[PDB]
A paper describes a structure:
At the core of our technology are highly stable synthetic scaffolds called sybodies, which are designed to mimic the natural shape diversity of camelid nanobodies, thus allowing for an optimal surface complementarity to the limited hydrophilic epitopes on membrane proteins. In order to mimic the surface complementarity repertoire of the camelid immune system and its capacity to efficiently target membrane proteins, we designed three sybody libraries based on prototypical camelid nanobody structures representing these three binding modes. Hence, our convex sybody library is currently the only synthetic nanobody library with a long CDR3 that mimics loop tethering as found in camelid nanobodies. MBP was chosen as a simple test case to validate our sybody libraries, because it is very stable and was previously used to validate synthetic binder libraries.
Sb_MBP#1–3 have binding affinities ranging from 24 to 500 nM as determined by surface plasmon resonance (SPR). An analysis of the binding interface highlighted CDR3 residues W101, Q104, S105 and W110, which are identical among the three binders. Further contacts are mediated by variable randomized residues of CDR1, CDR2 and CDR3 as well as several invariant framework residues. In summary, the crystallized sybodies bind to MBP in an analogous fashion as camelid nanobodies, namely via interactions predominantly mediated by CDR3 residues. In contrast, the structures of our convex sybody/MBP complexes revealed binding via the designed convex surfaces into a cleft of the target protein, thus confirming the anticipated binding mode. X-ray structures of three closely related convex sybodies in complex with MBP proved the integrity of the sybody scaffold as well as the utility of the randomized binding surface.
Numbering used by the authors:
A (entry chain D): 1 to 125
B (entry chain B): 1 to 367
């Protein structure tokens, strides 16, 4: 079973930044897709950023495009979500996810078989 | 544990779970058995954790290929449909719910890739893959292209590669042979060779991914794409006059997309196996039962012959079922993770030119 442990969360002020991490353990070699999703208090879960692990292509929701960057350190088995220029509407519980194959846009959440714990990034004005 | 005299059903949050609960209300109205339909997060992996404890739902809905691991862990009860019921579903769908020769779930719905085409640019889409080069020449002269689809993902390139004889693992009599892999036979070579030749002759670009293809079709820039029913909603809003049809043949043989069969399995720990059997066979897998779910969230093509023949009035759904019947059931064994990684590397290496097609497919077969 592919496992993911989450970290990096925090509470900061607007204009600040944060970096989320998510450690992958197990049969993680054949993974093809890694994504970051968030769920605001009492709202839908939203794809934020996704990465095709092979040739490193990246996909971003319009809400964070140009502010967030998804990156994978292969040598360390860890996917990062760099969250620059944080806004108050970025406050949500953030999840990372993994999948071997994908029939859909990598930003759709039903695609992914494995999931993390969900940490509360909080950004205050 | 799991309490008796009622049914708990787990189904993913993207499905029509309120329509399913409406079927559960009818079951309760006839039998007094309460049916509660929930859609927990992380369902695919929460079920094995909660079922291996002896806990969990009585019924779980998921793509058939995951049930293989469930059955391997002894988490699913062998089901007992009689011949009359089995005859109500398309025969290939039953093949999708076999594990080590035993039936371990009821097929519900059927999904596969289809050929999606722009009726304005192309009122008569090609029947064969060999037609596309000349067709791309015509549309290049009009500022368009013939075909754009995701080349970065084997799921999308497999219909072509598998057309003339490729396959993941050989299926025989309800079992897969882990040692018989068909990614390196003459059929797979012929198919991937054509894919690479289309790229060499500048008819497709090797870096085309999901996003590029989807935007290229939905902006009227390409006459055709390859995608599944999950994609129709974005095309609807794009105001592109599109149709959905059978995939082109290659060497006269149908394209063989992977088939996913949404299926309902029964928890081995369920003390309500007979109640679940009755609900699934006599209420859900009926015209009225599938219609209730479909009116909530469309199921696409369905395994039930009678209701599919009604749904197939939509030619898009008819095309989905036709491509499914001509396709390859996605194997339900754990070694598929190796197949994905291997075929992905080979296609990218062959399409990139970093390796010939022969050399590419010899490496995919060896681990």
């Amino acid at each position: 079973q592919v496992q993911l442990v989450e970290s990096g969360g925090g509470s900061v002020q607007a204009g600040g930044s944060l970096r989320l991490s998510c450690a992958a353990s197990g049969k993680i070699h054949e993974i093809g897709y890694l994504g970051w999703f968030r769920q605001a208090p009492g709202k839908e879960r939203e794809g934020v950023a996704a990465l095709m692990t092979f040739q490193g292509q990246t996909y971003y929701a319009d809400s964070v495009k140009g502010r967030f960057t998804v990156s994978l350190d292969n040598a360390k088995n860890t996917v990062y979500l760099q969250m620059n220029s944080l806004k108050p509407e970025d406050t949500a519980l953030y999840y990372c996810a993994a999948a071997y194959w994908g029939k859909q846009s990598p930003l759709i959440s039903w695609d992914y078989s494995y999931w993390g714990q969900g940490t509360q990034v909080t950004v205050s004005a | 544990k799991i309490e008796e005299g009622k049914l708990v059903i787990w189904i993913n949050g993207d499905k029509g779970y309120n329509g399913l609960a409406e079927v559960g209300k009818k079951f309760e109205k006839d039998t007094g058995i309460k049916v509660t339909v929930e859609h927990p997060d992380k369902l695919e992996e929460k079920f094995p954790q909660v079922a291996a404890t002896g806990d969990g739902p009585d019924i779980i809905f998921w793509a058939h290929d995951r049930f293989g691991g469930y059955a391997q862990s002894g988490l699913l009860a062998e089901i007992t449909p009689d011949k009359a019921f089995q005859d109500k579903l398309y025969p290939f769908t039953w093949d999708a719910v076999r594990y080590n020769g035993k039936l371990i779930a009821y097929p519900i719905a059927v999904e596969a890739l289809s050929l999606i085409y722009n009726k304005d640019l192309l009122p008569n889409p090609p029947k064969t893959w060999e037609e596309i080069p000349a067709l791309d020449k015509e549309l290049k002269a009009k500022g368009k292209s013939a075909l754009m689809f995701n080349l970065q993902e084997p799921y999308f390139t497999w219909p072509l590669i598998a057309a003339d004889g490729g396959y993941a693992f050989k299926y025989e009599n309800g079992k897969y042979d882990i040692k018989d892999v068909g990614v390196d036979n003459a059929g797979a070579k012929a198919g991937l060779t054509f894919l690479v030749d289309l790229i060499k002759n500048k008819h497709m670009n090797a870096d085309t991914d999901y996003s590029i293809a989807e935007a290229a079709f939905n902006k009227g820039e390409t006459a055709m794409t390859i995608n599944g029913p999950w994609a129709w909603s974005n095309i609807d809003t794009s105001k592109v006059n599109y149709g959905v049809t059978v995939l082109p043949t290659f060497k006269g043989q149908p394209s063989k997309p992977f088939v996913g069969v949404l299926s309902a399995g029964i928890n081995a720990a369920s003390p309500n196996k007979e109640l679940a059997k009755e609900f699934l066979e006599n209420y859900l897998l009926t015209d009225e039962g599938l219609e209730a779910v479909n009116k909530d969230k469309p199921l696409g093509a369905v395994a039930l012959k009678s209701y599919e023949e009604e749904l197939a009035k939509d030619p898009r759904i008819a095309a989905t079922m036709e491509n499914a019947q001509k396709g390859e059931i996605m194997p339900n064994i754990p070694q598929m993770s190796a197949f994905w990684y291997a075929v992905r590397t080979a296609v990218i290496n062959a399409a990139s030119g970093r390796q010939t097609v022969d050399e590419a497919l010899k490496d995919a077969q060896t681990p």
